[PDB]
Amino acid sequence: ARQVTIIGAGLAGTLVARLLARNGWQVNLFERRPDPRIETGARGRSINLALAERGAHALRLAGLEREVLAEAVMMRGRMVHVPGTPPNLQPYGRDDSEVIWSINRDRLNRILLDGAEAAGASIHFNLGLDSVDFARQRLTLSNVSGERLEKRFHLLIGADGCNSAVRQAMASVVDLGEHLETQPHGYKELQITPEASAQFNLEPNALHIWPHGDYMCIALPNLDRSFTVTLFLHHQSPAAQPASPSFAQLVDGHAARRFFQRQFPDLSPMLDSLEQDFEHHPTGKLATLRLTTWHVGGQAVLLGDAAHPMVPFHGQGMNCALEDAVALAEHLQSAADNASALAAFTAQRQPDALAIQAMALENYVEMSSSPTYLLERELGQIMAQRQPTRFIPRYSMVTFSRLPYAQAMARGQIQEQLLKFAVANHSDLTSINLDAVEHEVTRCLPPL
Ligand SMILES: Cc1cc2nc3c(=O)[nH]c(=O)nc-3n(C[C@H](O)[C@H](O)[C@H](O)COP(=O)(O)OP(=O)(O)OC[C@H]3O[C@@H](n4cnc5c(N)ncnc54)[C@H](O)[C@@H]3O)c2cc1C
Ligand SMILES: O=C(O)CCn1c(=O)oc2cc(Cl)c(Cl)cc21
Ligand SMILES: [Cl-]
C-alpha cells in the first residue's frame, strides 16, 4: 500500500484523505487545531460558505453530498438591497436545479473528517507542521506549547491553507516563483439573529448583497434563519481619498454602528450585536497568491488555498479546493509514479487556478460597483434563449458547470466582447439585428 502524509484537515486535505484511503493508501493526516468533533463548552463558529456544482460534484464522487446538503440552505438568487428600491430577487439560474447552497463551515469540516476516518485515514490533531527536511524525508510538528514530534514521510500533501507551512518549507529547496497581490479590502463577520431576520422579512433562500461601490456587505443564510453578514471595507483610506471609509476610521464598535446607520441604514437595525461583533471578531486579510511551481519532484505537492489563495468575491475557493482534491487523488491513483502524478496534476490545474483567481477579482465590481449593462444583459438573455448550448453566462459556467475555469473565462470573454460590440452604437434592442448577433454566437461559440 502506497503511503501519504497530509498536512491540514481543512476542506481539501480531508477530502483528498478520504479519496486516497478508500483506494487503499495508508493515509496520515495532521491538523494544528483540536478535533472540532470533540464537543467543548466553547461557543461554535457561525461561519458559512457557498457550495456550488464543482464542490457538490466533488462531494458526490466521495459519497458525502447527501449528508452535506441535508444541512444546506438553498440560495435561488441574488437579493440586492439598495436604499429606497424594494429588494427583488435576481434568480441565479433557469430553475431550482441551478442554485448555490449555504453550508456551515464547521459542519462541512466535521462531515469530511468522519468521511476520511470511515475510509481508513488516521487523523492526528493538535499538531502543526513547523519544518520539513526534504533530503532526510522527515518533518517536524509541534503542539501550541511547542512540544516537538518528528515523523518520516514518503509523499507530503500541503492542504494547509493560505499561510501554508508546506509551501514555506518547499520555498527553501525550490524557487516557487511566488507573486503576491495584496487586496486593499479587509473583512469583518457580523450576525443577524433568527428573530431579527424574521422581523425584517429577510428572504432565507437567497444570497444578499448591500452594494456601496468601494465597500459592501453580503449575507448568507443559516438553517436556523440566522444570517452571517460579511463587511468588505478598505483596511486604510488611500492618499488620494483621505476621507473615504476604512477600518482605520472605525476605532471601536460605536464608530462601526454610526457608519452602518449612515451607509447601510436598512441593514443596521438587523445587526443587534454589531458593536460586540466588530470589537471581538478580528479583521480578516485578503490576497491573491500565484505560484509557478506547486510541487518538489515526487516528494511534495500543494493544493487548495496552500497552492492558490484567491479573493472570495466569486465564492469559489472551497469549490476549487474540492475540485483540486479530486484531480490530485485521480492523478496519484493512476500515475506511473508520484513524480509523474504531481507534474501532471500541476500542469492540469495551474491554468484553471489562474483563471478563477482572475474571475474572482473581476466579480467584485459586478457585486458592488448601469445604462449600457442592462441592454447588454437583455441581448445576452435572448442569445441564451436562442442558443442555450452556445451562449451560457459566465456566472453560470463557473457556478453551475464543471467546464475547466480557463474555458469558462475564454468563452465568457467572447460573449462579453460580442455583447459590447453588438450594443455599442444603439439606444435600444429594436435597432439591434438579432440574427447578425446570433450569427456571431454560432460562428464564435462551439456547442457544449
Ligand atoms: C471571507 C471569505 C469567504 C469565503 N466564502 C467562500 C464561499 O462562499 N465559497 C467558497 O467556495 N469559498 C469561500 N471562501 C474560500 C474558502 O474559505 C477557502 O478557499 C477554503 O477553505 C480552502 O480550503 P483548504 O482546505 O485549501 O484550506 P482550509 O479550509 O483553510 O484548511 C486548511 C487547514 O490546514 C490547517 N493548518 C494550517 N496551517 C497548518 C500547519 N502548519 N500544520 C497543520 N495544519 C495546519 C488549518 O487549521 C485548516 O484546518 C471564502 C474565504 C473567505 C476568506
Ligand atoms: O455574484 C454573486 O451574486 C455572488 C458571488 N458569490 C457567491 O456565489 O458566493 C459568494 C461568497 C462570498 Cl464570501 C462572496 Cl464575497 C461572493 C460570493
Ligand atoms: Cl472564495
Side-chain angles (χ1 to χ4, degrees), residues 49-50 305 310-319 356 360:
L49 329 87
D305 276 12
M310 69 189 75
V311 296
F313 306 125
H314 217 305
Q316 282 292 311
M318 154 197 62
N319 287 285
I356 191 53

Side-chain angles (χ1 to χ4, degrees), residues 6-15 29-34 45 47-52 55 75 100-103 105 108-109 112 124-131 140-142 158-166 168 187-189 207 218 220 230 232 284-286 303-322 324 405:
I6 306 161
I7 309 303
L11 308 177
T14 55
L15 185 66
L29 173 58
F30 292 90
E31 168 58 47
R32 182 161 62 199
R33 290 170 59 87
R45 297 205 284 175
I47 307 315
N48 61 20
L49 329 87
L51 177 69
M75 293 184 291
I100 50 172
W101 298 101
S102 177
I103 176 89
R105 183 188 295 271
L108 174 61
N109 183 235
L112 286 166
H124 312 287
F125 296 87
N126 307 294
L127 286 169
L129 178 72
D130 290 320
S131 61
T140 304
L141 308 139
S142 67
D160 51 338
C162 64
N163 293 319
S164 175
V166 176
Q168 178 193 62
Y187 70 92
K188 183 86 70 186
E189 288 141 359
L207 186 150
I218 68 154
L220 275 70
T230 309
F232 290 98
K285 288 204 273 168
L286 303 178
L303 82 163
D305 276 12
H308 47 65
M310 69 189 75
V311 296
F313 306 125
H314 217 305
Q316 282 292 311
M318 154 197 62
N319 287 285
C320 184
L322 302 181
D324 286 349
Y405 291 129

Side-chain angles (χ1 to χ4, degrees), residues 50 75-92 100 192 202-221 227-232 260 263-268 270 312-315 362-369 373 377 395:
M75 293 184 291
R76 284 191 183 97
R78 166 203 274 189
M79 187 74 74
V80 180
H81 302 260
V82 185
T85 311
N88 274 340
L89 185 77
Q90 300 165 9
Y92 281 138
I100 50 172
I192 296 171
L202 194 71
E203 175 57 47
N205 291 120
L207 186 150
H208 294 262
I209 304 164
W210 287 262
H212 216 296
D214 285 349
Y215 52 97
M216 63 170 190
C217 285
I218 68 154
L220 275 70
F227 285 72
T228 303
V229 172
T230 309
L231 167 61
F232 290 98
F260 273 80
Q263 312 300 350
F264 298 105
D266 304 327
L267 173 56
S268 185
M270 291 195 279
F313 306 125
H314 217 305
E362 290 180 23
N363 208 50
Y364 182 81
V365 297
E366 296 302 319
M367 288 181 73
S368 197
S369 44
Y373 170 94
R377 185 162 155 190
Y395 187 82

